[model samples]
Target: CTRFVYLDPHNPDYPITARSMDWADDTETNLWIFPQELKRSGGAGQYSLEWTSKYGSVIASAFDGRKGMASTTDGVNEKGLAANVLWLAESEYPKTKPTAKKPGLSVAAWAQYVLDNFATVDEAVKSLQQEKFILVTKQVEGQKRLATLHLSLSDSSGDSAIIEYIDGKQVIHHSKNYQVMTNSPTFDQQLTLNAYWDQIGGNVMLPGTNRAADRFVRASFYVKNVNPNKLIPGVAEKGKIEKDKADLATAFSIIRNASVPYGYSLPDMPNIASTRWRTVVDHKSLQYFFESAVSPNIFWVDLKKINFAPRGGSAAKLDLGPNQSTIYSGQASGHFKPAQPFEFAGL
Candidate 1:
């Protein structure tokens, strides 16, 4: 499950778009920085697509150390464009065929592809509508079904879009209004359900359940209501912390309220659900803040300090260790060490 909001730059008090990342998986999550210099293929073998990154970005990702590339579950590029992938059981990518025309980009590289190539929501949306590549999937180890998911993107201009592969074709919901997204139900269905909740008014009542549909409505209500202006009044007089920081804290609180509690699970489904980590991105400041359910410290990577001079700087990695509980306080850009590029998971 996930929730994101675009802060209008026109607003005097707030100037950054904020987003959250939620997942129940036990995968070992790490924070990695992939420079624009490393060239990579989509990792899908013979038909696999390839691209040398046009831009550099930072990712709060996870990977089976054996796999070269970390799953870019959440990331933001130097251009202030952010992209995240959420589980979508309804996703159905096109089947590979001898006669197929589009190149094959592994499903794992979907989000990275966007961060690598596009600088703005409009730019990405326009090109994505052309549908130049087919998304190919690999079987998940120990699972009967292949990985299926959808993606969400937001930029500094407050532009937003949701990209999903349904019925073997790419479907995109493009608009500044399309903000929050969750799992299971398709994007269209999620919007329809949100409309119903909007009518009842969030203050009157809210769906207080952890189910995907319920969370969707709840996220929409709060994200719309808790604008920065409302969350932080007398911002100029607020504590020692800067007004922008205060506003960011409020945004974090709003999402945490909607986040699934750590270690939470149903009696009958012991292994089912809980949030492992949450990421909050300040698109305006180019900073990525991360929080782990297993740890108390909140640390971040400041993209402003990193050198992403297109093919000029060395790639770096911050090994978060197992469960991502390694403690690091405040800005963590200096913690990164030069490392070899991790490979994208492919067949």
Candidate 2:
């Protein structure tokens, strides 16, 4: 589950946008910072497309030690555009066509591709609507199912979009209002469910399960209902520290409300989800806050402190230990040391 809230641009005390990530599996999560290296290959020979990166990005990813950094579950670029990949059991990516017109991007690199190339939601959407590539998939090694996922995007401008491949075709829902997402059920159907709850008024009733549909309704309601003034009263009178603190607290509250309790599992469905970890990206502030379900503290990385100059920039990583159990607090950008970049899992 995830939700994005846009803060008033004129307000210096708030983030331009905030996003959350929710999942049941322990993703072996870690933070990776990629420099604006100017170039990237699609990782798959002739089927791959190479390009110069327009922006550097910081990503919160989950992968086995050997799978590399290709699995960017979510992250924000220097330009304040954030993207998240969530489960979508219905996703049906096109088969590996290797055609002349349609280039190839592995499913693992899909979100990274967007972050590397575009700086805004609109730019990404416009380019993606052209359908210039074939998104290929690979088996999950031990799992029988291929990865089926959909991506959600948000930007400092408050623009939002959800991209899904359904029946081998790309589907996009783009708008400032498209702020919440979860697994299963396509974006259109999710909207219908939201509309039903909207008519009921969140104050009257809301779906309360950890299911994606329920989380979507709850997140949609709370994000819109959060009264910024009430959240941080006397915004004009408060210090920047107090104001920023309040905004972070409020954003955390929304995501937490949508989160499934740790170790949560339904008796009838033991494989159901639980909250593994959470991430909040402050697009304008260029800070990414991370909280582990098993850790004692939350830490953040400031994008401003990272080196992104193409000529001298190098990739770096913050190893969070296995299961993301490492403990740290406050700004964490300084903790990332220069390391070899991870290779993308290729088809």
Candidate 3:
């Protein structure tokens, strides 16, 4: 449900990359927190290396019911790394036994999971490959059906990776240079097309479409070519890193400019969806920022600045429903959980 792109810093769309994450699955998803000692939490409480997040994050949710249990529709963790999940229609991930003692989480939560726990894309890539979870979906809740998804991670160091379960095993692609992820034939083919952009240079040409292939080309081109020196405002305000913020602002602008405006329809893929919200992350400083296509102001939360202790319980909620409520339609007037128990649609 996400598209990744690289932008040329000098091109007209240099700082802006394009993407569309439409038709988000209906699942219990939302950004959350597990204060240093707060007892409440949600989701399946799925097990892996169980450790409370020392960091806090801004995340996109799938459903309203769980804690760290559903998928992380999109998120920026305490660390500077950000992750998002998108469907890979070409493959299926086998359900594995939960590695830890808790209820299993899902693909959506994967990005936030790593962000909350890891500092870099490389670290998260290694852990995601090595870790196992009984991936679950809304279908398990008696919805359409459950489907396993792949993940993409990005950071300030300019490092990034794409994670997918193929051939019944985890696969990872890590590089500061590698960018762009759309629905799949496979990562390998995506790379081949990426090389095409490499030849033309992102500033000269880029793709614009909701198609997986199109998204891949556009993202790859723009993300890499973004203007590193673009002067974005409010970069040094509360809980933000100036250098990292400037870099991220450049990246986000590139993506937004590249994005198809509202009501955009893909001629070839009418069913293709668009982005609901986006997160810009400072990989170097671990600053996580949230920007809804509908919101006027961009906001950020520093994972490095927050205290995830039980005693640091605090709450903040936004209802973008009436304002910039495109993707956050149902999510706007929503509630955010501090910590709650995870629930499976079934047993």
> Which lDDT values do the candidates have, in the order given?
0.73, 0.74, 0.53
Candidate 2 TM-score, C-alpha based: 0.89
Tens-place lDDT per residue, model 1, 1-347, is 56576353324423344444444566677777888856777777676677888888988666737574346777889998888877535788776531234667776778888999999999999988987777877545654544567888888877789888888878899988877777558888877887777788799999886677777787777767764444334555444236567567766776776667776767663322577777787877888888877767688889999988654545778888877878899999999888766677767
How do the residues 1-347 of candidate 2 rate in per-residue lDDT, one tens digit apiece? 55566453324435544444555566777888887865666666477867777889888777736553357778889998888877534688775575656778777777889999999999999999998888877635654544577888888777889998888888899998776777667888888777787778899999898777787788888877775445344445555666666677777888888877777777774334677777787776788888876666588888988878764545788989977877777898888878766767775
By lDDT, the best candidate is 2
Give the clashing residue pairs of candidate 2, or none: none
Q: Which candidate, 1 or 2, has the higher lDDT?
A: 2
Count clashes in each candidate, considering only residues at least 3 apart in sequence or on different chains: 4, 0, 65
Candidate 3's residue-wise lDDT over 1-347, tens digit each? 44554433432222212234455332323445434322222244445323456555566555535432334456665555667776535556655555454346555445556666787778877766655455544434434444546777776555678877677566778876666676665777777887777876677777766566776666655555555655557553323244344555567765665454555556565445555556555444455455655445455555565554444455333323333332422222134433442332312
What range of 10 consecutive residues in model 2 has the weakest lDDT sum? 8-17
Prediction 3 global C-alpha lDDT = 0.53
Reference-based TM-score of each model? 0.89, 0.89, 0.70
Worst 10 residues of 3 by lDDT: 10-19
Q: What's the residue-level lDDT of 304 in candidate 2?
A: 89
